[PDB]
Design an enzyme around this catalytic site. Structure first.
Site, PDB file in Angstrom:
ATOM      1  N   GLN A 284      58.662  68.852 135.657  1.00 27.92           N
ATOM      2  CA  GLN A 284      59.043  70.056 136.376  1.00 27.92           C
ATOM      3  C   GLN A 284      58.670  71.295 135.571  1.00 27.92           C
ATOM      4  OE1 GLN A 284      59.863  70.766 139.322  1.00 27.92           O
ATOM      5  NE2 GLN A 284      60.413  72.917 139.002  1.00 27.92           N
ATOM      6  N   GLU A 285      58.792  71.209 134.251  1.00 26.52           N
ATOM      7  CA  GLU A 285      58.549  72.377 133.416  1.00 26.52           C
ATOM      8  C   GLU A 285      57.060  72.694 133.219  1.00 26.52           C
ATOM      9  OE1 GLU A 285      60.585  74.503 132.980  1.00 26.52           O
ATOM     10  OE2 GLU A 285      62.421  73.965 131.932  1.00 26.52           O
TER      11      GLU A 285
END
Ligand SMILES: [Cl-]
Ligand SMILES: [Mg+2]
Ligand SMILES: [Mg+2]
Length: 428
Positions: A284-285
């Site tokens: 996600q990052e």
């Protein structure tokens, strides 16, 4: 003689036969999951009995077990009822509409109509509704050739297409959606036939005692939104991530994660935390890119600020091992610092929120939840409050003020999905 229902309640156990697969029933060290598993579990609870799962290695075995003396109470395994009645099996009301889809390999020519299936290497599961679809098609096109496997699962068929062992397969749309995230080359060719409803199967005969309870339950599961929530968790990858997002994840899973998996595993072990959740945060990052940067002050695989990096002893945010170590250490620290009243698994979801938005703003969301008469220790409640932190009408009166709580909700939802996806990986 006791009815089927009376037998279950007498034995105090509901025996449910299914397939061994993430879509239906799946064992991980952490626990048991699956669409059919969770649904069956709720049904067992409704009946006030324990759930006992049995698995079959193929559909013929599944149906054979159901029809044998001393067999299980019902089958929950994403079953499509046959188009003609057979005395050996009765089906419940349908609980999910799925569309059969022909699957091909990106790089090869896309068949566009049933007629194009001739002259292809095709494999489907033996005993499936999909095999019957091809059997029927073969009557119209005698040259059609296809093979049936009685020893694999749908994930294996899609892998065969993905790596070019076969040209095509035919599977339900929900299985494609669930597996698109593993197979970067797999594509839908076309929808083959109209949507079909999945149903639970019960033994043959005139005893409706259990069937009527099954149908009562499924009606309630629909009403309460249970079927939708389960559908979204297990079969909603493409709906939520987008189609390109899904096969792009598959590519990254194949190409990027292997570079960093050992680091996530090492951090998970030394922090006593599931490495797949850490990896999910990483995706996600940065989409697992250690050189990733931003204009908001975060950098690296786990997207650390300079402040967090310093606090965690990270000397190089661009080093993947360090970023993973520090980010994982920080997540675990955050989680440990949450109020004791927040229990797992919610505790982990709260920790993801705090990873994104910080503990101060999160606490404001919890206080808002309590004030609204919601439970500040339940994630699904506090999750409703977080977006309000972005609106001046609400944040102006909070202790810490404005925060991008909408982005936080998205962050946590996505990480939870990636976490599921990684947990449901199976080996060739
Ligand atoms: Cl969520
Ligand atoms: Mg097997
Ligand atoms: Mg009757």
């Amino acid at each position: 003689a006791p009815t089927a229902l009376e037998r279950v309640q007498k034995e105090g156990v509901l025996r449910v036969i299914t397939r061994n697969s993430p879509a239906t029933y799946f064992q991980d060290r952490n626990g048991e999951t699956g669409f059919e598993y969770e649904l069956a579990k709720r049904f067992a609870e409704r009946l006030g009995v324990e759930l006992k799962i049995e698995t079959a290695d193929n559909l013929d075995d599944l149906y054979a077990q159901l029809s044998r003396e001393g067999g299980p109470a019902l089958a929950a395994a994403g079953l499509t009822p046959g188009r003609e009645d057979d005395a050996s099996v009765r089906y419940s009301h349908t609980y999910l509409d799925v569309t059969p889809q022909i699957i091909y390999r990106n790089g090869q020519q896309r068949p566009t109509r049933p007629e194009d299936l001739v002259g292809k290497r095709i494999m489907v599961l033996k005993g499936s509704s999909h095999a019957e679809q091809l059997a029927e098609l073969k009557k119209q096109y005698p040259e059609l050739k296809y093979e049936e496997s009685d020893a694999v699962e749908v994930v294996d068929l899609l892998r065969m297409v993905d790596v070019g062992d076969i040209d095509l397969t035919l599977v339900d749309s929900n299985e494609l959606a669930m597996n698109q995230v593993y197979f970067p080359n797999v594509r839908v060719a076309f929808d083959f036939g109209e949507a079909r409803g999945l149903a639970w199967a019960l033994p043959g005969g005139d005893d409706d005692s259990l069937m009527n309870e099954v149908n009562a339950f499924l009606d309630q599961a629909k009403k309460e939104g249970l079927l939708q929530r389960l559908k979204d968790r297990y079969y909603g990858h493409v709906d939520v991530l987008g189609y390109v997002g899904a096969y792009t994840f598959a590519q990254h899973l194949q190409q990027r994660l292997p570079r960093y998996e050992s680091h996530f595993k090492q951090s998970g072990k030394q922090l006593d935390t599931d490495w797949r959740l850490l990896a999910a945060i990483g995706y996600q990052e940065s989409l697992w890119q250690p050189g990733a940067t931003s204009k908001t002050g975060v950098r690296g695989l786990m997207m650390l600020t300079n402040r967090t990096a310093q606090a965690m002893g990270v000397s190089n945010r661009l080093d993947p091992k360090q970023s993973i170590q520090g980010g994982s250490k920080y997540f675990v620290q955050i989680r440990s610092e949450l109020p004791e009243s927040i229990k797992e698994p919610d505790r982990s979801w709260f920790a993801l929120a705090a990873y994104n938005i910080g503990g101060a703003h999160l606490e404001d969301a919890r206080k808002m939840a309590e004030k609204e008469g919601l439970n500040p220790n339940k994630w699904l409640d506090v999750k409703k409050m977080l977006p309000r932190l972005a609106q001046k009408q609400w944040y102006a009166k909070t202790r810490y003020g404005y925060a991008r709580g909408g982005e936080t909700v998205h962050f946590v939802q996505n990480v939870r999905r990636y976490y599921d996806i990684l947990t449901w990986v199976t080996q060739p």
